[PDB]
Write a protein that binds this ligand. Structure first.
Ligand SMILES: Cc1ncc(C[n+]2csc(CCOP(=O)(O)OP(=O)(O)O)c2C)c(N)n1
Ligand SMILES: Cc1ncc(C[n+]2csc(CCOP(=O)(O)OP(=O)(O)O)c2C)c(N)n1
Ligand SMILES: [Ca+2]
Ligand SMILES: [Ca+2]
Lengths: 678, 678
């Protein structure tokens, strides 16, 4: 049941969204106008506290078609969130709380969206984290976790391959609290969908195991829209897609056209719209009092009460289940277990040569039980990534017989881009969830649209990226990374760890898991690497450090990963012809760059030749080294020692390029690459 | 009608494949064993000349599941292509002709595959290029083009989102000559597909508009497989997926296990397998004379005859039709029209300030008419990219009414990753097709998977990448590139053009269209830019050049795109203070690096501080500059001129950092960043 006030609230939403876009003279009015009825019906029945946007058991809303952002900012204002009319008047302007696409950082905005296909795939991750939280902490009489995940989406999201991968996994996992509403308005930027998008969507979604419901009149059928949503709540075992037909830019003089997609409405058009809906055409950013009163009564006071009952329940739960209640209280505060890092493995020079992939396996097996918030996964490369702890139970529907929702190991299938946006979703859910995902380093590049949002939003997800170089060997250039780490070291706000040995792998895991706002790629080797004399977790935690020192060196060798042991053999060959080399291990550029300049210049000082050593692209190394020995062409298919050799990466090959660097600069005064002038 | 020689042929393929893998002691034996029946039936019925792998009307085969390579190498050898037993005996070894995943360079290998989902999406483009050549050149009595495009694919390919984008578009365009055979074997690397992949594949492909056919026993039912391929060739207006159930590693002691996916069979398993098939278990790389004789009569001599007929009909064609005959003859020779570049727009300082994206649009208007082989499109950004020429016909099915198959503008929809692979498949088809695709620069990263294979194989595809920087303005950080060019400049064999004005846009299109082995990204501005005094097609074609010279410069300013004009302005500001600045324009790192070292040192000499100016990451500039002014953080939502002012990119803002640079180095001797020690 809906009344006259509900229709006044739908008109107030539509005109607020239109006035926001028109003052900015930039933005997208069309999908805001077609989806306002659904937004009113959905938010009115969501359990949420506007006053406490972090309540762990709030229902979650994701706007996947992020260009429709004027609608999400109109709803957040009208329902009581911290977003005022003056912020809406600053839409798309420099420095405002209202950017052109929603950002994770704003209260009530769940994830950053706007790149198409990301929001629906993040919503699949949020629904998985809910299903895991519920299966881990709910007890008879204590339903602490039972929220819904709701998603709005458009034609562009359904054409993106990423939202196919996420929807196929979501259907397999039978995530029944995930309810997606598709704005089926037959329009994208180039015009009618008929021109390149006429697949049967409803049929594709039933193939994935989703339930598909239909709303023929999304423009005005409030009871049908409400019907459709509570029927979706009944199907516990299936995710649900509600295909809802609307007119893009409903109410506009050019309603139904692609011209209303992504440009402000004409002033004369805005005036007849306002007149039509019973509003004064000469006034702007007008909210009727009855509307503020209505959302106070139906959303905000019920939501504040719901959150208060949930808090009473949780403090009873902590009395009843002291261990589980202390664990979830610690997680809800963002804190890792005190002294958790005492459990990280440390090594010495006498321990054996191990590939850093197997060393990473050992860290996940030694800390999994210390950290209940750690949830892992592989994009079908579990045996090659060594991401699986053996006591692990898989994250699966309970009816499968392979695991249940309390499991902490996810089988992502061969879906790297949805694995990245799903890990962003699990992270964004809350409760200190620490998602990691595995794949070969070369195919993290398949997930670049999502990894970029991990860095922009600040979601601290971990990519466990194995098979980091030509050390892959025989699979050849299609599988051997060359450009990949130069790519992600150019991306702001991401750690790119390329650990050299066991102590450096524990350092990489310590910093990655302690991060609250920075994602991490941990690049790992196929081949065996020795345990280095001079490495430690303390040192390697600084991002870069002096591994092997010597007084008054002729050169500094800076290396990463498998090339650190090579540079150390190279300096032995150099010592024998009386050249003194300092060897510097640089396991992460990000973390090194964050150290104070005094520390960084003690690692890479003035007046010494510095040569970098790394079997990948040399394009990023001008910030740390004068000369660079790397590989700026594709790899080669053959046995890994033979391929290293072919590229010149032997102790004598490295020592010879160092002897050439010393000769080239002999008698010149050198300045550390670190020193900037501005 | 198969006989005992077809069973001996299928056994020799299985065993030659197992031996190829077992001698390397590396590789994937499972799917070559399961798909050998279907490869025998398909290749026996394909029209191809093995002594001319370039015949334009040859039927094409793509192995999308690239790790099954030993099956392809086997077939090429047996049917008389240029690949010997000796080559197979060097599989996965350094320097061999048989690398561990198939490469475009080998005759008979149509594209490089291995990265999953690529091959099936390339095959879509090969089908589109065929439907356009047939429609442009076939005349009554002269059917010059009519080939089929055959695809083998596996489960991994079906999980990747790129094959959903490509399969959706393929159904829309009604590509009836595309026939794909799905190896339905129930296993992927992590075990059984039920663990993460239980969707209804058939029902999903019928929703895209494809026909689905089934072969329940692919292990042995040759007639059934031949009956599916024959019925699929009747599919004239629907692509066809043949779901063929097989057992992974059929014949092995561990057939149906994922342990047989990506490791050699144990030596005694290979023995029993040889005995089971009627082969001596102590001999290897054995091809029965009967199998060679048979392929010579079924494939090779009929293919030579089919090519020879096709040759005489093309001679008749050129006489009946001299105009189209001459054009098709020039395209098959792979040459661009005599002196086509004369139609490229040139400009002077006196002309208007134009966005570089709209200069791009004018070039495509002046050339689509000169170049029949130019086929373009956009990933639903046609109005924002100005990629559609006014007189263009869209590439659509005739039934659509919206255009037809001789049309040369493709509506790809929001499918960037598939647009990249489809462009690779159109280029790989031959006949000098020059594909280009438009999207925003920030979302070319959605397509990184395919862009890397354009560079690795050398497909000269062109990306018209608009909205190159914070000059996007109001859409904000989710749409503003920062790291994107640093990434593709770190990738070997790809041109990344960032033109500053009218003449540099023309030079970017002439080098990109003349290119035979190197892809290109052209980054273009949303905002208006001045026509530069001193720019020319001839100088910008060198990749970097002196735009503004002075004798005895205090500083060199190196810049690209929108920051070249800013740099000219800052140089007027520095001139006022008695500082003399040479301005260098560097529209492409790749083309500039190809110039002779003495030309590069003339542009960037020793003894002068060199400062780079570009509103994107600074990390790749150390190969050219001493110091760099750029943005190493994400963008901001606001009007574009206010955002440029916010980051310091003002004439006097560049001038001030130029003065600090002069100050910091005054007194030091400076080496060109171009000079290397080894
Ligand atoms: C990955 C990606 N590619 C391209 C764009 C640019 N873009 C923004 S909206 C849009 C299509 C509009 O799609 P739709 O969801 O149908 O719009 P609506 O009906 O919501 O107006 C495009 C191509 C994008 N934001 N992200
Ligand atoms: C994009 C990409 N991601 C990951 C891999 C690693 N990989 C190779 S085969 C495969 C899984 C097995 O796929 P399937 O097609 O089911 O194999 P088959 O049944 O043919 O053995 C994976 C994950 C890859 N080659 N490309
Ligand atoms: Ca739409
Ligand atoms: Ca399979």
């Amino acid at each position: 049941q809906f009344t006259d006030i509900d229709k006044l609230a739908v008109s107030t939403i539509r005109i607020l969204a239109v006035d926001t876009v028109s003052k900015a003279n930039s933005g997208h009015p069309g999908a805001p106008l077609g989806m306002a009825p659904a937004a009113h019906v959905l938010w009115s029945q969501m359990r949420m506290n506007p006053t406490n946007p972090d309540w762990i058991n709030r229902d979650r809303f994701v706007l996947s078609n992020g260009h429709a952002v004027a609608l999400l900012y109109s709803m957040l204002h009208l329902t009581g969130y911290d977003l005022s009319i003056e912020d809406l008047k600053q839409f798309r302007q420099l420095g405002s709380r209202t950017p052109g696409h929603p950002e994770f950082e704003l209260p009530g905005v769940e994830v950053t969206t706007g790149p198409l296909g990301q929001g629906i795939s993040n919503a699949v991750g949020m629904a998985m984290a809910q299903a895991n939280l519920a299966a881990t902490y709910n007890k008879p009489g204590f339903t602490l976790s039972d929220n819904y995940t709701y998603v709005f989406l458009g034609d562009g999201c359904l054409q993106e391959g990423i939202s196919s991968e996420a929807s196929s996994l979501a259907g397999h996992l039978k995530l029944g609290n995930l309810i997606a509403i598709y704005d089926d308005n037959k329009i994208t930027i180039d015009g009618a969908t008929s021109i390149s998008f006429d697949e049967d969507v409803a049929k594709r979604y039933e193939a994935y195991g989703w339930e598909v419901l239909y709303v023929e009149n999304g423009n005005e059928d409030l009871a049908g829209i409400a019907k459709a949503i509570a029927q979706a709540k009944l199907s516990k075992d299936k995710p649900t897609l509600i295909k809802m037909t609307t007119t893009i830019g409903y109410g506009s003089l050019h309603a139904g056209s692609h011209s209303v997609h992504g440009a402000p409405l004409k002033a004369d058009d805005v005036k007849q719209l306002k007149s039509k809906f019973g509003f004064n055409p000469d006034k702007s950013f007008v909210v009727p009092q009855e509307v503020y009163d209505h959302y106070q009564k139906t959303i905000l006071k019920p939501g504040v009460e719901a959150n208060n009952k949930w808090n009473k329940l949780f403090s009873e739960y902590q009395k009843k289940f002291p261990e589980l209640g202390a664990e979830l209280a610690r997680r809800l505060s963002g804190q890792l277990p005190a002294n958790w890092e005492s459990k990280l493995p440390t090594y010495t020079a006498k321990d054996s040569a191990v590939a850093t992939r197997k060393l990473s396996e050992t860290v996940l097996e030694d800390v999994y039980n210390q950290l209940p918030e750690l949830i892992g996964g592989s994009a079908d490369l579990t045996p090659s990534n060594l991401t699986r702890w053996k006591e692990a139970l898989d994250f699966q529907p309970p009816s499968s017989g392979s695991g249940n929702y309390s499991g902490r190991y996810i089988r992502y299938g061969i879906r790297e881009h949805a694995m990245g946006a799903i890990m962003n979703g699990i992270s964004a859910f809350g409760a200190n969830y620490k998602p990691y995902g595995g794949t070969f380093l070369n195919f993290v590049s398949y997930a670049a649209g999502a990894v970029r949002l991990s860095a922009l939003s600040g979601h601290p997800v971990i990519w466990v990226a194995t098979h980091d170089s030509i050390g892959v060997g025989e699979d050849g250039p299609t599988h051997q990374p060359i450009e990949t780490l130069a790519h992600f070291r150019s991306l702001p706000n991401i750690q790119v760890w390329r650990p050299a040995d066991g102590n450096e792998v524990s350092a990489a895991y310590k910093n990655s898991l302690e991060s609250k706002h920075t994602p991490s790629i941990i690049a790992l080797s196929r081949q065996n690497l020795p345990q280095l004399e001079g490495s430690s977790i303390e040192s390697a935690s600084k991002g870069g450090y002096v591994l092997q020192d010597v007084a008054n060196p002729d050169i500094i060798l800076v290396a990463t990963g498998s090339e650190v042991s090579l540079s150390v053999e190279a300096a032995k060959t150099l010592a024998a012809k009386n050249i003194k080399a300092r060897v510097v291990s640089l396991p992460d550029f990000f973390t090194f760059d964050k150290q104070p300049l005094e520390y960084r210049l003690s690692v890479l000082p003035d007046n010494v030749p510095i040569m970098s050593v790394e079997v990948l692209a040399t394009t990023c190394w001008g910030k740390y080294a004068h000369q660079s020995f790397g590989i700026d062409r594709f790899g080669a298919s053959g046995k890994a020692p033979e391929v290293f050799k072919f590229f010149g990466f032997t102790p004598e090959g490295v020592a010879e390029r160092a002897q050439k660097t010393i000769a080239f600069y002999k008698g010149d005064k050198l300045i550390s690459p670190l020193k900037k002038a501005f």
